[PDB]
Design a protein around this ligand. Structure first.
Ligand code: UD1
Ligand code: MG
Length: 473
């Protein structure tokens, strides 16, 4: 621990004198708290240098590293399903939920997982995913003929701001049927916010700097610091499924995805769907021709010309169309070996710059700006992809209508709203029912309860039966 004076000196030597503009006029407790806040920032001069640093030839992945659920035979998919249900039934599968984002585009005070897309069940994203988990645990247990149901640890990464309401939500709901010990919360770190030029850290208040979650890429360090990686080893976990909280269709702990990784012996794998259109705000999974490594090019950093390139083999398609749906597979053995490397260098987790309108101290009191006035920093979870060996990387293309419908925007937008989430969810439910001989009245849509079906299976009993709009099956 450094003394109050030492923390101050270090920030001054890093040229952050603006941070102490009003220091002397603060009470002693405000000064002590400010210093406490400042001391969590490891090596400021470096960080400010690293931020300075922050301020192309791609092609499609080789066929050898790709596979698609829309092409594989029922037997292969069934075999992967079994490989995954076995891993699950043996207590080898854990799930990592990234829920540290603020979801600004959604305009809501509560954490996004608490969001209710108004399905007939009124169930939140969090509840939907928890029943998804209970369900696959049962499917795994049936498959293995176990007496006891396997447990799938659900590690939920929250941010300082989303933590209390998230944990409280789960407690208030008795964990949605899950064992209280299998839902494990841990906070990711933050990074200071900077001025538009990126050389000065912004003051939120006379005695506090503006800070924000360090991006989903800050998960690796949170994993190590919060003893999560330690827990994986102690519980004998071998497989990890990491996903985004906003996907209302997400197949949590999808046995097919896990079987796919097991079958091929992949250290790392990821899911993609066909890009909606040139402008869809999705990263794209490609092969960097320069180093012959898999990687993702984010939607906010790809050139307009490249996002619109037509495919040389087919004019009607976009050349780069493997949209990233934030569904990753990691082997625990790969994480044990790589996490130490990934968090001790900007090489695999470079900062990403995002201009923002940041409510903060005016250069002299608070104020809500109406044009960008600073930058937030973010590390991206996929920046470690090129560190994997190509033949150890897998890319599974899946069906969007069954696996990806994100909640990104408040109602009113054309895409990725509570309304599109709801419709996609009900359409998938209705299709499963109908696909099983069920009959839904015209203009009717039903909801399938995960307790009844994880993803379409076990719906045979629905044959010949009729349904009305809004029924829950
Ligand atoms: C960096 C990244 O993943 N980009 C992906 C993200 O875009 P996008 O920019 O929309 O990312 P989001 O901001 O919604 O974050 C993705 C996920 O990471 C979480 N999160 C984010 C920031 C943070 O500090 N902590 C944290 O836990 C969010 O809670 C969410 O579960 O989803 C798109 C699919 O919809 C993909 O095509 C993009 O490639
Ligand atoms: Mg292939």
């Amino acid at each position: 621990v450094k003394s109050q004076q030492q923390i101050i000196d270090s920030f001054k030597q890093a040229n952050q004198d603006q941070l102490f503009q009003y220091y002397d006029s603060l009470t002693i407790d405000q000064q002590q708290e400010f210093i406490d806040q400042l001391s969590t920032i490891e090596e400021p001069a470096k960080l400010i240098s690293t931020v300075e640093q922050a301020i192309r030839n791609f092609t499609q992945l080789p066929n050898e590293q790709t596979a698609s659920t829309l092409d594989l035979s029922k037997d292969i998919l069934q075999n992967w399903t079994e490989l995954g249900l076995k891993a699950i039934g043996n207590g080898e599968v854990a799930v990592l939920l990234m829920a540290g984002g603020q979801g600004t585009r959604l305009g809501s005070s509560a954490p996004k997982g608490c969001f209710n897309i108004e399905l007939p069940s009124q169930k939140s994203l969090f509840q939907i995913q928890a029943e998804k988990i209970l369900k696959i645990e049962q499917l795994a247990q049936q498959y293995l003929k176990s007496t006891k149901k396997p447990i799938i640890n659900w590690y939920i990464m929250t941010s300082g701001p989303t933590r209390n309401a998230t944990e409280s939500f789960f407690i208030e709901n008795n964990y949605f049927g899950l064992n209280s010990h299998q839902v494990i919360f841990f906070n990711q770190g933050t990074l200071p916010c900077f001025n538009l030029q990126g050389n000065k850290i912004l003051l939120e208040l006379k005695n506090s700097i503006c800070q924000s979650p360090d991006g989903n890429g800050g998960l690796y360090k949170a994993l190590k610091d919060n003893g999560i990686l330690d827990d994986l080893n102690s519980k004998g976990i071998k497989h990890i499924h990491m996903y985004c909280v906003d996907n209302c269709l997400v197949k949590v702990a999808d046995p097919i995805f896990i079987g796919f990784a097991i079958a091929k012996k992949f250290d790392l794998a990821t899911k993609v769907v066909r890009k909606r259109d040139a402008n869809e705000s999705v990263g794209l999974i490609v092969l960097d021709q320069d180093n012959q490594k898999p990687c993702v090019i984010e939607y906010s950093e790809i050139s307009q010309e490249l996002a619109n390139k037509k495919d040389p083999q087919d004019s009607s398609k976009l050349f780069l169309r493997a949209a990233n749906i934030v569904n990753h597979y990691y082997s625990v053995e790969f994480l044990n070996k790589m996490i130490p490397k990934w968090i001790s260098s900007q090489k695999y987790l470079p900062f990403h710059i995002a201009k923002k309108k940041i409510p903060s101290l005016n250069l002299g009191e608070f104020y809500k700006p109406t044009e960008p006035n600073g930058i937030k920093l973010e590390q991206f979870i996929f920046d470690v992809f090129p560190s994997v060996e190509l033949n150890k990387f897998g890319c599974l293309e899946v069906d969007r209508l069954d696996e990806f419908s994100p909640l990104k925007n408040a109602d009113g937008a054309k895409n990725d709203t509570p309304t599109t989430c709801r419709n996609h969810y009900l359409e998938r439910s209705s299709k499963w029912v109908i696909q099983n001989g069920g009959v839904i009245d015209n203009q009717g849509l039903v909801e399938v309860d995960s307790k009844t079906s994880y993803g379409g299976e076990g719906l045979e009993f629905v044959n010949g039966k009729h349904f009305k709009n809004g029924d829950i099956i």
